[PDB]
Amino acid sequence: QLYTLDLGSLVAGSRYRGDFEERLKKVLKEINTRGDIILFIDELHTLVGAIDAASILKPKLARGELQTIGATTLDEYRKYIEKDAALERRFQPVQVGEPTVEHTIEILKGLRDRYE
Amino acid sequence: VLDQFGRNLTAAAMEGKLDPVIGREKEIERVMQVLSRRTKNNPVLIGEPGVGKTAVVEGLAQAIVHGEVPETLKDKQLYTLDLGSLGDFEERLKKVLKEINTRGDIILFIDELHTLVDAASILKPKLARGELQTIGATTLDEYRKYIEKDAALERRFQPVQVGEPTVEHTIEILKGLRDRYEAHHRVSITDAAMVAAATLADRYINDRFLPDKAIDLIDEAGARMRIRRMGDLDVVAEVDDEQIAEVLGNWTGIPVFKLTEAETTRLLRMEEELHKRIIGQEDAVKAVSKAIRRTRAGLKDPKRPSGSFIFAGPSGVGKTELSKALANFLFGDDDALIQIDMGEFHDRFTASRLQLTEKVRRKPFSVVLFDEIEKAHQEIYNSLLQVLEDGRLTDGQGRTVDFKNTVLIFTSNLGTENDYERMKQKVNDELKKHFRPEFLNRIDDIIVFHQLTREEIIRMVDLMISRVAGQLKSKDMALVLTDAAKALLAKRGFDPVLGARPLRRTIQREIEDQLSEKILFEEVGPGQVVTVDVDNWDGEGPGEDAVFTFT
Amino acid sequence: SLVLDQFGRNLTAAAMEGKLDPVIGREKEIERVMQVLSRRTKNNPVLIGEPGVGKTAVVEGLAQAIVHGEVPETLKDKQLYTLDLGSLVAGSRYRGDFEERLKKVLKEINTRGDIILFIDELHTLVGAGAAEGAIDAASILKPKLARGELQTIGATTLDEYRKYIEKDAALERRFQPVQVGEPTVEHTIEILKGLRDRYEAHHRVSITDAAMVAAATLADRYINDRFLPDKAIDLIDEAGARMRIRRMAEVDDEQIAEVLGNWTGIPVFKLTEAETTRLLRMEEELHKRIIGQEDAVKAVSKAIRRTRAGLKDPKRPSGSFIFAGPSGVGKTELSKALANFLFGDDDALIQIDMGEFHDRFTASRLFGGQLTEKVRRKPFSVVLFDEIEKAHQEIYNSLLQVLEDGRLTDGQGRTVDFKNTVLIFTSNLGDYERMKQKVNDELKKHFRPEFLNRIDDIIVFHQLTREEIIRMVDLMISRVAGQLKSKDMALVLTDAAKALLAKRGFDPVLGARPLRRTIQREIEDQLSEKILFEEVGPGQVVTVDVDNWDGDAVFTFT
Ligand SMILES: Nc1ncnc2c1ncn2[C@@H]1O[C@H](COP(=O)(O)OP(=O)(O)O)[C@@H](O)[C@H]1O
Ligand SMILES: Nc1ncnc2c1ncn2[C@@H]1O[C@H](COP(=O)(O)OP(=O)(O)O)[C@@H](O)[C@H]1O
């Protein structure tokens, strides 16, 4: 199961001091307990900032119990993410390019049914 | 408490978890030099990311455990300090530093020392007291940015450089880590695969650096082999040049046919791949072909640029388009051709800028063009002499720009078969008097272009009118040009002084404009081929009495 | 107290413990520091000196004097605390972290009443905190510095003092300058003799007197990027560390020579001070790369011996020689060989040709410059001046005064010294005795004869004889083979092929410059196209031969 992570859901309602930490640790425990969940954290650049939301994930990502997929703009990657020692060593930039014009034609042909 | 707030490297070596290091003997002995001093005894490792800065520390830990260190470094435990485990922050950091000082035999590895320069309020005085012995790891720009301008640290931190590993060193590193990767992926990797992976990581990849740049390809090929491989079947797997080529094709978006094959054959089918784009200049084509064959093949001095060409001929008559053709073959992109014109650089303030350094650093495997070198500044001349002589560029930033893989073409309008023999004679004469002999003495070759003839100018006309032919096919129309109109349009556009550039104006005025009015007139509009023709003309006159006709 | 510890180190308590290195010969500066520190109002001294002269050493010696008790009553039992601005500037990502930390430090100082600040890098006081207009460290220290209640000791660099402190007159009138100049050779020897005890205790090695003497006398004249005695101490300390890793002994001239050779790349036997014996064998060290010109080699060798002996007046440049003769004789490579012998580096020579720099605007580039910056980076450099015939009168006058006083006053406002610079004027203007009289009358009518008076030697090169051209062909084929031996290609050059190489290479009207072009065209290009088209491959010898002339010619790569 591939789950995308909503940080707003984590941080909403976390009025008490340790509620965010408890929520993130419970999420990580559930992920490592089920053993078949992949994480997709869209906008990986805003992970810093809930102690932070990202600072909880640094010990886990260093030890390899957590596997995540990020998504970032070219400019934001060179400014927010790589400026760390436990992340630049553990994240692999997979470049996704702008589709070619003929590839865009095929993409539009594949989306014809839903718009029609 | 140190294990709860950091990771021990010396204790990890008995477990053997740490990867072996290969070929870092000189940097490790330099690190023991710096660590075995009394002033400036803390080394900082300087190098690009993904070069092996932490590998030097790992090798130091392995050598400490193996017992190849002086008495000062005997039984010294290296501890990588991670900030993730660390009011409470300052006291826990002070407690762990106090425990380090109480032990007295702990050496801290603090990677990315820019994180200090919000712990700077704690570690900076402690290292001032000399009770903390630390190995730092930063890059060159950061070291020249933060540490070098911080006067309080040159008394306590000494730089040691971790340079880029060579190709053979990268191959040896891959051979060393073969056992680890064969164990992890349960795949078998051959030596030719690692040699190919190192070479292609050096050649087609820019954004990373060796040996991370090739170990990534090796790991990616192992992952692909495990994906494509996974009743019972035997374990018969062999990562070879094919898997590495496919992985790099998926990486950099290069098509799978002939991406990595005989570069000799690639250089030898030069002529027809120019001939689909270049017009005429067959002598110039074969001259530049044989020059790039005899210069790029490693027969020239390896500490020099791959080639240096002089393009003699009128401006825009075929030299520049041939440069784009060479860029599209060797390096694959027109934008890979960095466009530098000496007409824009006519003063010292602009000459000192040599928007050229970051462009050639964007792609080291890119062609460098210098247009109209006659009016370049003298500082430009001296920089060109330096670059051609030592094979390097020393920019104002202060980095050695790699120029093995850049090829230089000097595009100029100087001097513009017996007539062409006299042409070449006076071109080299004017390069002996208007220019100076040593600059040409450090030029690989000079080629002088020829004036384009009748069938050459017709083959220019038909290809460039094919642009509006395609634009007209886009409107369910077709365009036909007769030979009489071709010859008359060539005669109208015949200007050997200015070249074929006024032919653009003649095309744009006579053909596209009248056709654009005519399609709006809606008589030779959609649903009919239009065939241009010329009336009131014999085939020899200048064309003042001749009129274009549309059917 | 408890808050100064996280920002600084107690120098007085550390000197009481016995951690501080002793200072040699800084009695005057430390006395001046007590003089300024004893004042009632504005008792703040700032130590101005180049980086690496010992300003922090002066402050530490002051702490050593305070703890023992050789100070007046106004400096007795005063805890000297160092303070760094970087531990306060960093972490100021909010509105008032910097002001809070600095106010806490000042409050602790005022409550203690016996704290003197050694704030290093004083020039960052204006730039710390906010900008220079808003509230910064200067704005919070100035109301208290002027009344002499906050005793502080600053340290800075001369140019940074003139550019940062002197612009702010209110801050400039609050700090008394104390000049700490760069020590000489003998003071550096005394410093090394003082610190030998600490370094031999730390390194477990015995340092001889020749060791410190060699360290100082090599660091002072070879390293110019820093200032003494930081460089000599660095040499001794690095040599001790090298010995300590090699043992798993004693430090002498060999250790210092090898560590400085590692630092600079110059070979070790050069750095050994066998200058006379090196001067004894330089005839073959110069002839090992040059061909013929035996009279020229002898003349330049006796010139080098007469100049480097030190018997002349030490108000002149080391040497100044004119090189006359036709081009292609090898004057440039001779200058390069001289640079290689005298200093050990091929880049130690500067190649400047003024034929492209004619007007005064280009003379501003010349001096006022890359020449000035390179002779400031290293004053022991051979300069090469090509084509002095077409010179402008301003260039003439500047050359006159430069060679006159051994000194150049550039447009940068600096007096750059030329006392050991070797000037080589490779002039193409104008049997051996006859060439003297021909140029003697001709330079005095083209230049002034004060040129010929002030110059040292005129060395005239004759044309290269055919067998010398043959040996030059051998030398160039040697490096061609050196760069192509990677592919196991063996070249044999027959006598007829050598004659063709000589005749297509030697242009008597133009000299022996065009060899480098032709040897790449007539040999390297043909060999390249023969390897590419697979007529010959690796591991086969090619004995190249030629037809059509034995004493239109085609080269056969047999
Ligand atoms: N000489 C070597 N021998 C073996 N492995 C090496 C060597 N140099 C680098 N490596 C490997 O290359 C990888 C790249 O490390 P790097 O990215 O330079 O570390 P950092 O991110 O701290 O700069 C390391 O994991 C290391 O194992
Ligand atoms: N008189 C001296 N006695 C002993 N050591 C000295 C003396 N003068 C300078 N030094 C040494 O020179 C080095 C640089 O001095 P310091 O003032 O700490 O830094 P800088 O001079 O660069 O400001 C110090 O390590 C110090 O030991």
Curated annotation (Swiss-Prot), chain B:
Binding site for ATP: 47-54, 313-320
Top-level division of the source organism's lineage: Bacteria
Free-text disruption phenotype from the record: Depletion experiments (using anti-sense RNA) stops degradation of anti-sigma-E factor RseA.
II, as annotated region: 239-416
GO cellular component: cytosol; peptidoglycan-based cell wall; plasma membrane
Keywords: ATP-binding, Chaperone, Nucleotide-binding, Repeat
Single annotated GO MF: protein folding chaperone
Region described as I: spans on this chain: 2-230
Task of the protein: ATP-dependent specificity component of the Clp protease. It directs the protease to specific substrates. Can perform chaperone functions in the absence of ClpP. Degrades anti-sigma-E factor RseA in the presence of ClpP2.
Family membership: Belongs to the ClpA/ClpB family. ClpC subfamily.
Protein's UniProt name: ATP-dependent Clp protease ATP-binding subunit ClpC1
Species of the source: Mycobacterium tuberculosis (strain ATCC 25618 / H37Rv)
Gene name as annotated: clpC1
